[PDB]
Paper text:
The domain composition of [name] includes an N-terminal peptide, an ARM-repeats region, two SAM, and one TIR domain, which mediate mitochondria targeting, auto-inhibition, oligomerization, and NADase activity, respectively. Here, we present structural data and complementary biochemical assays to show that [name] is kept inactive through a ‘substrate inhibition’ mechanism, where the high concentration of NAD+ stabilizes the tightly packed, inhibited conformation of the protein.
We therefore pursued cryo-EM data collection of [name]-ed hSARM1E642Q after dilution of the glycerol from 18% (which severely diminishes protein contrast in cryo-EM) to 2.5%. We carried out 2D classification and 3D reconstruction and refinement of the [name]-ed hSARM1E642Q to an overall resolution of 2.88 Å (applying eightfold symmetry). The hSARM1E642Q octamer is 203 Å in diameter and 80 Å thick.
Author numbering:
A (entry chain C): 483 to 549, 560 to 603
B (entry chain B): 362 to 549, 560 to 700
C (entry chain A): 56 to 482
Write the structure that this text describes.
Amino acid sequence: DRSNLADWLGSLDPRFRQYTYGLVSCGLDRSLLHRVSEQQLLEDCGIHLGVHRARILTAAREMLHSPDTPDVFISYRRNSGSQLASLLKVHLQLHGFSVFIDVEKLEAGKF
Amino acid sequence: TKVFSDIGAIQSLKRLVSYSTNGTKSALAKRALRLLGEEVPRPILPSVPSWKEAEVQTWLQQIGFSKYCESFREQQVDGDLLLRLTEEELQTDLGMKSGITRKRFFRELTELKTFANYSTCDRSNLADWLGSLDPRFRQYTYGLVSCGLDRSLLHRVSEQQLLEDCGIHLGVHRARILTAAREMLHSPDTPDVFISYRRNSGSQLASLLKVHLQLHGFSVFIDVEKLEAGKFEDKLIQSVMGARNFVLVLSPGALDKCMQDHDCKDWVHKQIVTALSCGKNIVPIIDGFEWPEPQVLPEDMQAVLTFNGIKWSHEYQEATIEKIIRFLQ
Amino acid sequence: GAGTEVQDALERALPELQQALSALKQAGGARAVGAGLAEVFQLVEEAWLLPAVGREVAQGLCDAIRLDGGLDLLLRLLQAPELETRVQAARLLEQILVAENRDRVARIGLGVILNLAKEREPVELARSVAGILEHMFKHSEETCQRLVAAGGLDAVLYWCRRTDPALLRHCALALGNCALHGGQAVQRRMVEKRAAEWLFPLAFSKEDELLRLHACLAVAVLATNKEVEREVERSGTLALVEPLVASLDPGRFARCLVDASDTSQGRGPDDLQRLVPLLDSNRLEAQCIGAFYLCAEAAIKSLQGKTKVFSDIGAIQSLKRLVSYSTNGTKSALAKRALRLLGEEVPRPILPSVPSWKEAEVQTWLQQIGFSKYCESFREQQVDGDLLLRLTEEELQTDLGMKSGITRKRFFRELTELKTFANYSTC
Ligand SMILES: *C/C(=C\CCCC=O)CCC=O
Ligand SMILES: *C/C(=C\CCCC=O)CCC=O
């Protein structure tokens, strides 16, 4: 369940969480949910209780409006500076720099 | 060893070795299955729709439905039929009584259909389109290319068609395909050059030039010297007379049959004449040619020696090509 | 008998590989490795006579160099700036390159192979490099996918504008393997690299007949890829196929396929299952190259008394269709020959004017699409031409007694092929 549809359904009503798998199998996710029909919910996703369909479907429709250049490069000896290299990258990536690392393993493709 | 079997590891490993692409993940899988002792399955050829009854039996065994191999052979299901099996056929004809078993079958099939290489049957790469909507959709490729839909036609299909014709069963899925389809409504005697040459000597250079020039946006024609019929090959010269540019491949002695060809019957001789006649842009390409006396040629073609030619070099092929193009009009 | 000799070989060859391993330690500047290379290359060339002497002794000698042999040392020898001897290593590597070595060098050698591929000008080198690439391409989906993208294809294509039999033969075989073994993706890339138009030189050279056949097998397989069909068609090289298959004789090239050393295009159940696609295509340029080759094997394999291959490969029924609904003389001559060479009776072509067919012609076609189980019911209900073209599922089920839905389905599929070939002029 990539979209935590479980928790969404679970917010409508804890008893709804049971329909998770049936919905993630028809492939619906949170973004698609705004488009499903009563019929789909019934046949495809196997929600059987009309009352339940209707509530899911409704809350779905309220989800219609409620859905070569890195910054830095680190060059270093893989044998000695490998440690510092990674460490910096991490730190800088946290701080909003896209970094690149001297992956020294490759010789092909016009030197 | 009984651990792995019960943990549900063996069948999982088999799949990593059946529908594999990566070398490593597959090496490892092979090793593991051997280490457990269980036979290692050979990978599946992915081009399903061109599979014979033999390959269907192999996959039936690697997804363990061997109970059924016999019925599949007796009804000689092959590649095409496999990809098109319905629940009914599976139940009745192939004799899979259990709904739950049908369901596990189809689940295995859908994995196949998704790994399939559909190149032989899909001219419009509908596979990749469907696969962009959602990787799980790629499984409908064959069903759509069989109703003949292609990318250009897709904008016109109905929900009903998708359901019945192409056998997409899940409404939800139909609806998404159909929608993205509708967004695809708005998102759906004279060659330039002729090369005349001796098929025995200049055949090499001829082709080479054509290729190079075709890359560079000239439509070329070649001296396919094999034909004598149809009013002394008048069709041959319709091409030359129409060919704005005329490349002559001058190999060492390319003008042998042209030499004193008074009947104008040698195709090379003929062409030279007709090009000269039409006042065509003649570019001789010099690759070992020693220039003869014009008098040894018929008068109608003597003047072809009076066109400035280009030295051929295989070594700096591209450079030579650019100069030749420069000389073309 | 064979093993005794293989063992005998290894008893000399392995210490000879060690005699080489001593030399393998140094460089070829002073021909320290140079002699050693010249030795072991020719030693495995003397042992390359053994696959012929026996049947594919290649494995034995190769495994020696692989498992513990200086296989990796030869890969490093390529890297070694002893260009004079790096071609000698390449020559040797090209030789010692069975499936075993191929997989191993796919892990390591691959990188160095391509690093050495970027070297172009040295012709002798290039020959051996295009050589290793040719074997490499025929390894795995991902191995192609690699080489193609990495300029391995771009190497063989830049060497396709050269003038050297072996170089050219190799390039042709490569683009062959690359088209065959590689995926959809690989193929698209080739055609978009202008590979179809680059096979033209090879296919247009009366000088070399085998080069042509190889060159055309390649372009033919590309045209089976419906998605790239048109681009191959407009290349011009696709028209150039059919004449060629007429010229040569399958028998003649069958002899030349005995001694393919399973390095070029050796006889095997693999190749057969990869030709059947062609025999089964739309393009008749493919169905020609298809039949030609499958006929060359229909010779050898019957001589080896192993016909059972074709039957199982699904080749026989495919061939029958090429001889039933045929138009072209060549593609049909070839088909007839092949079926005779396998011994299986050759079907007479079908008269295409279906709707004027009598009950007799319906029985004949029922037999050539193998539904003989049903011939009797078709005669008892005296189905003729008109009725055949109009059969419904219901009639087929009930009246003609085809119980199985799946069988009905295969029937109709065969019928639709008929209806499409039909001459409907009378009606
Ligand atoms: C060893 C086998 C496949 C792995 C491919 C390695 C590619 O790099 C095939 C044998 C299957 O049992
Ligand atoms: C030899 C047969 C057909 C080929 C036609 C040649 C045309 O050029 C017929 C015999 C069938 O078995």
